Amino acid sequence: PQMGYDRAITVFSPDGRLFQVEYAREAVKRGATAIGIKCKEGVILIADKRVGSKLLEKDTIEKIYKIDEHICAATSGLVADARVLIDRARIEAQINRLTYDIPITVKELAKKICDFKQQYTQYGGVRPFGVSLLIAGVNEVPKLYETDPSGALLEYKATAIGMGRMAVTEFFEKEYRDDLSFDDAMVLGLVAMGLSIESELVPENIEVGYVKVDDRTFKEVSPEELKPYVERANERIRELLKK
Amino acid sequence: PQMGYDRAITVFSPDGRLFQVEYAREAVKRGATAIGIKCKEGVILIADKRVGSKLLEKDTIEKIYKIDEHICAATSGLVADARVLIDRARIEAQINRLTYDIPITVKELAKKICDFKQQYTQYGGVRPFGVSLLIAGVNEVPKLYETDPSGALLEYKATAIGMGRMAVTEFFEKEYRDDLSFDDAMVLGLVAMGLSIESELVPENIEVGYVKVDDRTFKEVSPEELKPYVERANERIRELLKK
Amino acid sequence: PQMGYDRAITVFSPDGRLFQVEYAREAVKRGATAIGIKCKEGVILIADKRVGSKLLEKDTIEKIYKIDEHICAATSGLVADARVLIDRARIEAQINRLTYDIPITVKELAKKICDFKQQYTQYGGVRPFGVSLLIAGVNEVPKLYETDPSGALLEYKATAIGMGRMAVTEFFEKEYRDDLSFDDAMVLGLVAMGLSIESELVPENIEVGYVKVDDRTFKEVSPEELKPYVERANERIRELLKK
Amino acid sequence: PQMGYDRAITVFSPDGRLFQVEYAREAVKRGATAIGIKCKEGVILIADKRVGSKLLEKDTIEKIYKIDEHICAATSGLVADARVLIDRARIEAQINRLTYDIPITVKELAKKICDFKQQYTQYGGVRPFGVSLLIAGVNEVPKLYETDPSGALLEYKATAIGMGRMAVTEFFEKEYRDDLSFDDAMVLGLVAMGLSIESELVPENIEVGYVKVDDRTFKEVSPEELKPYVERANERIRELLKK
Amino acid sequence: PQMGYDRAITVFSPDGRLFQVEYAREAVKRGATAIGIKCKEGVILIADKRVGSKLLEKDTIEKIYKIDEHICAATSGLVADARVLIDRARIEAQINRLTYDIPITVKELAKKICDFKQQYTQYGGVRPFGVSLLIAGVNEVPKLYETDPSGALLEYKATAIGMGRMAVTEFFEKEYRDDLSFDDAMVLGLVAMGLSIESELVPENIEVGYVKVDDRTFKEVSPEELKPYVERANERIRELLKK
Amino acid sequence: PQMGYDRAITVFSPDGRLFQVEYAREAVKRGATAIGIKCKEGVILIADKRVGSKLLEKDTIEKIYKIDEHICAATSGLVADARVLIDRARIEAQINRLTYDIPITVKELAKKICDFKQQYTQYGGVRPFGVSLLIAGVNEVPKLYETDPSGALLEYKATAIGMGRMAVTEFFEKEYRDDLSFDDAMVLGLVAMGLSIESELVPENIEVGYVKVDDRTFKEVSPEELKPYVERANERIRELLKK
Amino acid sequence: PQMGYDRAITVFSPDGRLFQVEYAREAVKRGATAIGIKCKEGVILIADKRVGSKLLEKDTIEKIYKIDEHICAATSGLVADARVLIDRARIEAQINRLTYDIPITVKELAKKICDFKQQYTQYGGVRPFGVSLLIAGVNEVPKLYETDPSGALLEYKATAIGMGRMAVTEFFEKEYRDDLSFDDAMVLGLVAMGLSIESELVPENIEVGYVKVDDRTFKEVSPEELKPYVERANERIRELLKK
């Protein structure tokens, strides 16, 4: 964070860093937290959709976006930048079915959106995207990817982006199981969101989507199908939040 | 608001912000306030058209613009920038009927104008549009959208842009009803404008347009058809303005 | 007017302004004043053509320019910039007759020249035009438009640009009538120019052009046809200038 | 002349000026003075060709350039810039005979060279031409034009550019006659040059070219045909220079 | 490392250096160390894949990448930059089989990726890749190449990149044999990694790939086939680490 | 020579100058002096080819270059820049014979190379050529041209460029005759070079080329054909150098 | 070496210099020295290939590069830049055989690579090549060329580039003979390298290539064919190094 080397994406600092990329990362920190958790039977995406005003048509707010029948995605960072990236992913998913006449894999999609972001990182009159993404889906096996403003790509078993990344990360870091069940993964995910917010959850102010190995079809969970999971989740959240 | 990071749209500040976008937002704050309110049977747009001079051909001043038969729009911020954005929306509405041989939805239109604005946000020799828009219309259900200089897009039930956003927003925040009637929404809207200006309204210095679910046809209200609503509105405005 | 934000057209100031546009406006303030006045039967344009030297071939000086048979225009600001804008308007008028095989309206012409100016306002290696224009003519009804360096467009009943805008504006603001007659409008216009200059007029050092609803044909007034109007005008100018 | 706003042609100063254009004008001030005088029967161009060295092949020095059979031109300012502008005018004269199959008028030529100069005034990586021109000729009537580095264009009866503009201008301002004769105009012109230099003239160190209404054919005057005029001119110059 | 000459890739310093390239090299220093060792029967690549978190799907982490059947590669430096370079190498390998209908050599591949990197070193709006690569394979004889952010290319017998370059380099510098055997080269390589980390190795947190002269086919070694080598390696590492 | 206005070719100084052009001129001052002298029967070019080392293959050093059969040229300033300019002239000479199927004149060639140089004077990312040229030849009459880094073009009877311009210029200024003979011009030229160097000449360390009106064919003079002229030249040089 | 004028290749200093070019020259000074010596029967190139590490596959290190059957070349300065320049020369050699269906001459090749380097010297977003080259070969007669980062080109009888240019140059300056024999030239060359390094030579740490008038075919000398020459060379080196 040294002046003189931090206001031009194309300039390296004396200790080999791209401060404009690090600064862009500060933008995604401010976003509502989005969680991703994978298990044996599928992958889940949980996002916080609490709004500060009742004037917002929250009945139409979307935090988890369908990219293709089997690909899923969450967002964090600059709003407009995020939307553009998601449309880009969708277009990319369509191009694939045209060129190879088959659906694109989660890995290839995440990889293409990240190569795109990487380019907005090494040219002078260009600003990097101020957003991170969670790309989830099911190819032959479930998949969970996390992107970075610089274009870096990492595959996780469970993770998060936005305000509560730290909390969620440490929690999963201490209680995530390589063998959890879909419903366990679901609950564990909601609990995480809970610690993250430091409050019991309200099924109507959190969005959940997933893709299971059987259907390979993305689908959002209704607050009704979601209520039972929140109830169980709130139990432990309550139990852990201030003993 | 820190020098060194606030005079280039492509530069992030150390705390992850785009000050040139925030400054652009300062431009829309200076504009005449435009209100948007949605209800069961339709959506309404109310704009303040008071002029500081009698030399202006106010008989031809337009604050609410028809984009298509069912799409409506209000503006706030840099004048020339605004006009360009509205022509862009219209062109976009025509392209849709050509390509898909069907009318564009409110969501898609707002979405396309915002993707356009987003791009004037991440390239070096480009200035962001200094304006916010209220895109209103009726697809299958009424719709009210608010845009931002950065390209962000939000759906509301009721909101505002320009000088009186705060006032109008807090008022609606305390008395907007998810079940109001067209005429109620209308009056509530005029009242808001009233508090905003801190004065009883004059039907001839405010413009109102709307789109109802039945006709799906935009139409402006004549000061005559509007006079009764102002009278009722001024009653409450009078009652609330300084008790 | 704060250093740091005023030397790049694409930079917004902290209070949301485009200082380079405001500075450009300072250029039009220095120009000879041009007046525009509309009435029932037509529109009139009056410009001051007094020169500081007898060496100038003033017998060929033009302050009011014909754009098309029914469109008229005056200028104020940087000289070369102005000429370019007028040729642009003419070309634009020709393109219209080709594309739509019909004459362009005053509104559309003013609108196209302003969209052009707006663009020289949001790109990095471009300077805004330092000039304002008065576009006058007759479509179905008389028309008077005033342009701005930023591309803003406004329709007036009567107005002015250049040095004497203030004077002329306040005068019209106090004595312009929505029902004046051509000859009244003419005299009122000359009087304004008079106050503006603070001196009785000399028919040979002022240029007048107009477009009436009947002919829809632009034409300049000879100093002979103009002398009677000046005489009457000088009467009131004399009467008002220092009582 | 305020630092901060004077080293980029595209930047307006707080008081609406283009200092780089004003600075460019400082370049033409340093050039040998060129005079232009028009009369009933034609137009004349007189240029000072005194050189500081005998090594220069002054027998081939040209200060007045033929553009076309009826168009004439003088120069002042940066040398290389000037030459380029004159070749541009010639090319422009040829293009006209091709496109419209008729000779270009003096007005149109001057107008085209000025629109060209105007453009080198509103783009970032471009330097304005540091020169002014006197374009003279005969269309239906004699013509005398003066150009500016910014692209401004003015028509005169008599004028000058370069070092002695002031002197020559004030002199013509006090003794130019709208009805002078060719020979009178000629002498008056030489006298002006005289005051300008503050010395009697030497026919061999001044170049004169002209275009009369009868021939509409440009031609230079030999020092022999010119000697009689200088003699008469030197008489008055002598009479006026230090009484 | 002198300010004034170190923030523009195209600027040479007074002592003839490209500081932005030197700074880019500081980025590769921070990466996990990758080792390369060549012997009579083939070439080996060893990379450290220890992760700081159990949440990373390390079961899918790749530090050694297959470029073609006979070409191998390791990476160090900016993550996104590295991935882009490897895809570039693969594309380059395919182009070769198309154009010359034969596999590209290791030398030609390394050479093409380095010419590409060199270009991102001499143009103004371009940032150099912050990564070094180890390109290994078998043409007629085994090959080991090391790249630099500047595009420099060097052929080694044994070497390394990343954090432990120094350690590994000095070790090989004192005990590398021009005649070692595959298994010896393997062990020597693991030992180096050991000193580098200052700890006995764990077969599961190090990745090894190779290409032998017989098969000319790249293949990764399983932690099981690798365990015996680690055991022997840890013996000497233990023996050398703090006597 | 004022900081703030002297490091960008496109910026005019407050007193209307292009300092980068004046600085470029400082480069030609450092070059070996080249002399040009014209007479009745032809034009001559004399250049100093003294080298500071015997390791240079001076037997192949060329200071006077043939452009075409009748066109000749000398150089001074940046070496690489000069060569490029001469190849440009040659190409230009060939283009002429193709387009007009006739040889280009000296005037047109010099004019084309100068228009080219002028352009490297008014664009932002371009450096001006740091060289002056002496273009000599015979069209209908002998010709001698001198160029400038800015693109200015002047015709002389006798002149020089490089270190000894002053000396040579003053000498010719005092003893050049408009009627000298080829051999006189030759000797006078060598004498000049002599004063310039302040030493008697050595035929082998000076290059002479010429073009006479009869042959219109360029040809270099052998040190043998040149020895007699040097002998006579050294006589006067000796006589004038320190009396 | 004055700040303010030394960090932009396109800027001239007040005393007419291109400091970025002079700084680029500082880069070639740091390179291993390469020597070039010409004689009656051919041209020789000697380069120092001593490495600081045994890990480098020096058995494949190349300091002298074949450009074509008769053209040879050595390098000094930035590594990556050098390689690019040599590939450029080779491509250039191939283009020639295609276009003129004949081999390119040494002069033309050197000339083309230098015109290329000259261009990376006068454009704003471009960095100059930090390298000098020795281009050697045999056309009708042997040839030895030395290039410069600025694009300057010089022909020598004997010379050098890199660290030991001074030493080697002074030595040749005192003992080079215009009539030496191939073997003499060879020995003299090795001696030079010797003084340069201040140590007797080791045939295996120096590379020698040559092109004789008879074969016109480039070929490298084996350390075995080279050992006899080193032995003789070391004799004199020993004799001269510290008497």
Swiss-Prot record, chains A, B, C, D, E, F, G:
The protein's role, per its UniProt record: Component of the proteasome core, a large protease complex with broad specificity involved in protein degradation.
Q: Name one GO biological process term.
A: proteasomal protein catabolic process
Q: Which UniProt keywords apply?
A: Cytoplasm, Proteasome
* PANTHER family in the cross-refs: PROTEASOME SUBUNIT ALPHA/BETA
Location of this chain's protein in the cell: Cytoplasm
CDD domains reported in the protein's UniProt record: proteasome_alpha_archeal
What is the gene name? psmA
Which PROSITE patterns does the entry link to? PROTEASOME_ALPHA_1, PROTEASOME_ALPHA_2
* MF terms in GO: threonine-type endopeptidase activity
SMART domains found in the cross-reference section: Proteasome_A_N
Question: Which family, according to the similarity comment?
Answer: Belongs to the peptidase T1A family.
For this record, the Gene Ontology CC terms, alphabetical, are:
cytoplasm; proteasome core complex, alpha-subunit complex
Q: How does it assemble?
A: The 20S proteasome core is composed of 14 alpha and 14 beta subunits that assemble into four stacked heptameric rings, resulting in a barrel-shaped structure. The two inner rings, each composed of seven catalytic beta subunits, are sandwiched by two outer rings, each composed of seven alpha subunits. The catalytic chamber with the active sites is on the inside of the barrel. Has probably a gated structure, the ends of the cylinder being occluded by the N-termini of the alpha-subunits. Is likely capped at one or both ends by the proteasome regulatory ATPase, PAN.
Q: How is its activity regulated?
A: The formation of the proteasomal ATPase PAN-20S proteasome complex, via the docking of the C-termini of PAN into the intersubunit pockets in the alpha-rings, triggers opening of the gate for substrate entry. Interconversion between the open-gate and close-gate conformations leads to a dynamic regulation of the 20S proteasome proteolysis activity.
Protein name as catalogued: Proteasome subunit alpha
